[PDB]
Amino acid sequence: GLDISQATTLKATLEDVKIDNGTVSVDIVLTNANGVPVTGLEQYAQINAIGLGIAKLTPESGKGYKTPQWVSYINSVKAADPARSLANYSYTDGKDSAGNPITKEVKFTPGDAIQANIESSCKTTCLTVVDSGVYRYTFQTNLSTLPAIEGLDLTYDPTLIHRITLELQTDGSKDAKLVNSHIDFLPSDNFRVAKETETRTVVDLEANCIKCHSTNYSDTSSTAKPLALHGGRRIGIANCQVCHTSYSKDPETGSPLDMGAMVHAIHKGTYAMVGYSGTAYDFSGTMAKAAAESGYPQYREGKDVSERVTLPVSIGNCQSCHSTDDKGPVDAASFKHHKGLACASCHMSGFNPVDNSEWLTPPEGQKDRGFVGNYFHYYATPEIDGIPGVNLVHVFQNGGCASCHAEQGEEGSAKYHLAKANATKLLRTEYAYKLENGTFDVAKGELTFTVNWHSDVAPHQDPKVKEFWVSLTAFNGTEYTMGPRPSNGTLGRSENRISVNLAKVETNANLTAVPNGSKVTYTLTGIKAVIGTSSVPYKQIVSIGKGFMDGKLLICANSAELDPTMDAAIDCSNTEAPIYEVIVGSNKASFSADASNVTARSIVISEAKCANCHGEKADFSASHALTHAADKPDNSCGTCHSAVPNTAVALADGSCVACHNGAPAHSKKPFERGFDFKVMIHQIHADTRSVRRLTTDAATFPENPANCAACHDKGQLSLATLGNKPAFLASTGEYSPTVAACASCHATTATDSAVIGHFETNGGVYNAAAGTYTPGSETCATCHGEGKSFGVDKVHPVKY
Ligand code: HEC
Ligand code: HEC
Ligand code: HEC
Ligand code: HEC
Ligand code: HEC
Ligand code: HEC
Ligand code: HEC
Ligand code: HEC
Ligand code: HEC
Ligand code: HEC
Ligand code: HEC
Ligand SMILES: [Ca+2]
Ligand SMILES: [Fe+3]
Ligand SMILES: [Mg+2]
Ligand SMILES: [Mg+2]
């Protein structure tokens, strides 16, 4: 009491107990959710797995500090399956400068390989009940009778910190009756629990991975996507680390299984390897491309997986995964120290000591540092590096050793990796500004507003300010509407938006700036529109007379400034240094007839949640690269199309919805790739968008898209006023607001006419003629609003 077969939850800790003579054993305390010990395991006919592993944490040395690494005592040499040993291939991608197609090559090194593993085949056979719920595992594996493996030192050493892991699973259970636990200890100190500061953690699931990954292991829905590997049984980092060691490899490809090398390459979209049952897992998507383009008979659609990982931050954004704020692992700084496979996993993509065998020999009369060392020291170039434009050899020759080789508490290559992110923070603080409310004299066509700038050197006088965009958008109090595309006007070519570069006051005849210390008052004139049936520029700005103003300031920063006590900002016309751009947003101010506030548009998503995956203050100019991207936002087509820059900053306050709303202007897309913000964002992240503008690859969303709480906070989906918004008029017809929201996943076309009829029965319109919907007519909220009978929070797999 209580019997395993009536237990609904298991919790286990193998925190307990220890070994001698090479013979290892450990106690497993198996209990309830509440903590009633579960009895009868050792007899149980419904056990799926019981696995235990053990490993020592060996030290490493070289120039500077290098972190310790796990060695499993349990290992074996695996041979490659001949028919699943992947062949080399190539594929076309893009054109060179002459306009000729570029061919890329992907290369492998199939061959026998070491793999760390655990003890899985024993199960109950190794168990002796010792107490209520408390079992005892003695390893079949003895530390003394371990078969030698070439290159690997497997000798037992009680002075080194040690790990044992448990994976335990019953009744086919993906969560409730699944456990991974582990114990680290120091055998020599009578097997005492290791201090956090003694073992090796490096990354923590919650501090480092959860910002993007789902850990809803029990998720039953069709779109579940929890981070649980190997049939669903492996979920804890501490467990990964025993098998995914620096020496393990996939024999079919030569790919490393080292945890860092594997994790960097997966998220960079370069990793490929063959796993259980000969399934090829290609994280680049290029295998499927090659198969399509020239044949590749080892790729089997519907069994092998070849899809490009689409990471929502830069692979250079280390803080996404490695803590720098001292609230993660105590050994978090491990990422600052050189380690061949880690460094190579980004900078040496696609190279190997067989196809790049020259790099095994240093240049004449230089020291041999191994394959990776020699690349970093001698052979790397900007044209070939895994991060294009990077020059490692120049840092070797010119930047001093402490650039990569770090003593404990030094920065090492982190000085290069975090430099732009750090300077970005400082410059956003230093150039912070406030927009005051504007006074719009509509009959005069004149908007006056004041910027509270950081100093008495105004934006147009500061050569480190590349551009300083302020955009104003009409807002009628219900929802933004872009409207039809007008003919061009002096200030822009949109009915509802004007963007003006305040840094170019001296050459803009419509713009005046009057400084008063730090405060600069700007007067923009020529905002005039004849109101009738025709589309004309500023038509809504003029007829509504009010709305919002948003700032997007671009500061030029010096990419060669690495010392954080120096000034990062640099004169934009400087020619020595490569320059990168720092973005500084603002408050969202109002404009109106007397400069009083305009009530804020409702907030229906969480800024912080977008930032979990995209990082803080992500920029989306590059999302506007397809069409008229080089047109400036004060100039004709660029008013809407610009990427230089796109003039929105924040994600949750409706800045994007100023354009991405239910009334796209011209060359309209159909619903199934529609322009309206909720429709677009739902379709991208749920892979229901028929076509993405800039890539043929579907987003690889690391959460469950039906987990509404990935983006929405509790209380944001009441749906109470949603039916009062304007319908979304797509190319072919219009869709009422709640319909557009739900059908973006549920019905991107009229495939299932029961769903469509459900919409039409309850006040909804779906691909109807323009003007059919009357705001107010949808009655969706009564049943689907949060907390109702079929509430969006009850019916989807949410985790708030
Ligand atoms: C206003 C036009 C709407 C819209 C846009 C939706 N609903 Fe409903 N809905 C209700 C019930 C009882 C179900 C079935 C529940 C179940 O089988 O578990 C549904 C189903 C849906 C869906 C899912 C359709 C699909 O199979 O993909 C969608 C997208 C949807 N609804 C949207 C209940 C109600 C109501 C109770 C009287 C009301 C009113 C509405 N729904 C209104 C709307
Ligand atoms: C030892 C029992 C393992 C533990 C614990 C974990 N993994 Fe693993 N994994 C292991 C091996 C030997 C292999 C290669 C198999 C081969 O055929 O050569 C892998 C493979 C992966 C992969 C590649 C994709 C796949 O084959 O499914 C991934 C992404 C992976 N492993 C991840 C991973 C994670 C995150 C783990 C902790 C939750 C983890 N594995 C534990 C062996 C073992
Ligand atoms: C998740 C998508 C990551 C990003 C982005 C970066 N790193 Fe990483 N890194 C990650 C993991 C899961 C690990 C393995 C930890 C382990 O159990 O081995 C690492 C490891 C490294 C290491 C090696 C650390 C060590 O073995 O002690 C280094 C040197 C490293 N990472 C550097 C690094 C840099 C510079 C990054 C930004 C440019 C970066 N990593 C990103 C996960 C992820
Ligand atoms: C990054 C651009 C580096 C700079 C600058 C320097 N070194 Fe380096 N070195 C680097 C790597 C990635 C490696 C491989 C490490 C591995 O685990 O494979 C090496 C190797 C060495 C070694 C061997 C011992 C070791 O620390 O692993 C030595 C002794 C060494 N490098 C010396 C060295 C010196 C003297 C440098 C300044 C003139 C120097 N390195 C710069 C990366 C980089
Ligand atoms: C991807 C997760 C990486 C890992 C692993 C490593 N580095 Fe890296 N490196 C990466 C990026 C995205 C960049 C460019 C940074 C930028 O702001 O543009 C770099 C750059 C470097 C540099 C500077 C190169 C130059 O300025 O020309 C060095 C010296 C460097 N990287 C070294 C290095 C070492 C030694 C690593 C192992 C600890 C290592 N990198 C891992 C991305 C990634
Ligand atoms: C992780 C669970 C995410 C959450 C939370 C948010 N986004 Fe996302 N998004 C994610 C991925 C993996 C991708 C694909 C990235 C790629 O390179 O293709 C995206 C994509 C976007 C895009 C499109 C970018 C492009 O095609 O140019 C947009 C505009 C976007 N995401 C916006 C966005 C918003 C506003 C979110 C909060 C409501 C948000 N995302 C959350 C991963 C995740
Ligand atoms: C008008 C001034 C815009 C604002 C403000 C925002 N976007 Fe936009 N976007 C706009 C247009 C005219 C286009 C068409 C394509 C082009 O290159 O001009 C787009 C397109 C997008 C897309 C394309 C997605 C796809 O079809 O797969 C994305 C992902 C996108 N825009 C994102 C986006 C975000 C997140 C914005 C707020 C930061 C945003 N846009 C503002 C016009 C305008
Ligand atoms: C805002 C008032 C716009 C201005 C000014 C111009 N365009 Fe545009 N365009 C706009 C939208 C919202 C869209 C997407 C419609 C959708 O439903 O997704 C477009 C589309 C195009 C296209 C099609 C390619 C595409 O990215 O979808 C083209 C070729 C195009 N726009 C050209 C174009 C030109 C030449 C303009 C100046 C004469 C111009 N656009 C202005 C919105 C707006
Ligand atoms: C977004 C910025 C991420 C963070 C932070 C981390 N991961 Fe990730 N991971 C991300 C994406 C977009 C993908 C592809 C889509 C998907 O979820 O399948 C992944 C994938 C993985 C995998 C492979 C899963 C599989 O198919 O076998 C692994 C093993 C993985 N990610 C691990 C992982 C770890 C350990 C992280 C913290 C150190 C982590 N990721 C952070 C996006 C993001
Ligand atoms: C991030 C990738 C999202 C996930 C996951 C889900 N939604 Fe969403 N939603 C997203 C955005 C960018 C928007 C528009 C935001 C804005 O400022 O306009 C929306 C909007 C909605 C709406 C309209 C709500 C309203 O305006 O009153 C609804 C009804 C909605 N989303 C529903 C919803 C459901 C039920 C989800 C889980 C199945 C869900 N969303 C996921 C972004 C994201
Ligand atoms: C993508 C992010 C979605 C949004 C937006 C909406 N829904 Fe959804 N919904 C989505 C998925 C992938 C699923 C399947 C979940 C599962 O457990 O397999 C669902 C489920 C439902 C259901 C269940 C009943 C049914 O007949 O399917 C209902 C009733 C439902 N969803 C309603 C609904 C409404 C009203 C939405 C707009 C407010 C809506 N969903 C948005 C994915 C997404
Ligand atoms: Ca394999
Ligand atoms: Fe035309
Ligand atoms: Mg002027
Ligand atoms: Mg564009």
UniProtKB/TrEMBL annotation:
Mg(2+) 2 binds at residues 624, 627, 641. Ca(2+) binds at residues 250, 252, 274. Mg(2+) 1 binds at residues 505, 508, 511. Heme c 1 binds at residues 63, 66, 338, 340, 377, 401, 404-405. Residues 200-417, 604-797 form the Outer membrane cytochrome MtrC/MtrF-like domain. Heme c 5 binds at residues 222, 742, 745-746, 796. Heme c 10 binds at residues 627, 637, 640-641, 666, 669, 693. Disulfide bonds join 122-126, 556-572. GO terms for molecular function: metal ion binding; oxidoreductase activity. Heme c 3 binds at residues 115, 230, 240, 243-244. PROSITE patterns: PROKAR_LIPOPROTEIN. Residues 11-188 form the OmcA-like N-terminal domain. This is UndA. Coiled coil: none annotated. Heme c 9 binds at residues 624, 627, 641, 656, 659-660, 689, 693. Heme c 8 binds at residues 610, 613-614, 623, 685, 692.
